[PDB]
Amino acid sequence: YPIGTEKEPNNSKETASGPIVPGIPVSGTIENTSDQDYFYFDVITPGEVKIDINKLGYGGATWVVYDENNNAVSYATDDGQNLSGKFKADKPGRYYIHLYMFNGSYMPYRINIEGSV
Numbered sequence: 001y002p003i004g005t006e007k008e009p010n011n012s013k014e015t016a017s018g019p020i021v022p023g024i025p026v027s028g029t030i031e032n033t034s035d036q037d038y039f040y041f042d043v044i045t046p047g048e049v050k051i052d053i054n055k056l057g058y059g060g061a062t063w064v065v066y067d068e069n070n071n072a073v074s075y076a077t078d079d080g081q082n083l084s085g086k087f088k089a090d091k092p093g094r095y096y097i098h099l100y101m102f103n104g105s106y107m108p109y110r111i112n113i114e115g116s117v
């Protein structure tokens, strides 16, 4: 049952919205800097995973991806308008995207994921 949008409250990993799957963009909004948005997706077979989050408002935001054991496997690179990055998932399991805004008022966004998901 893939999602197309975040589902509040999703302010922790235990309440993360998901799963996210390739080919189905996910919409949300960072409401203000106190809004933390967590998502999850499942890796079923080893492979490269790519994440692109289009920033559809002004502000500083970024994301980190965690594995099930709270290790960070991937951090965002800002190109100005997209927060992107990729990693090699050596092991199947659930991964979590932690998205937040460190400095901004209001940010819509759109998550796209590609690869072995």
Ligand SMILES: [Ca+2]
Residues within 6 Å of the ligand: 008, 009, 010, 011, 035, 036, 037, 038
């Ligand atoms: Ca949230």
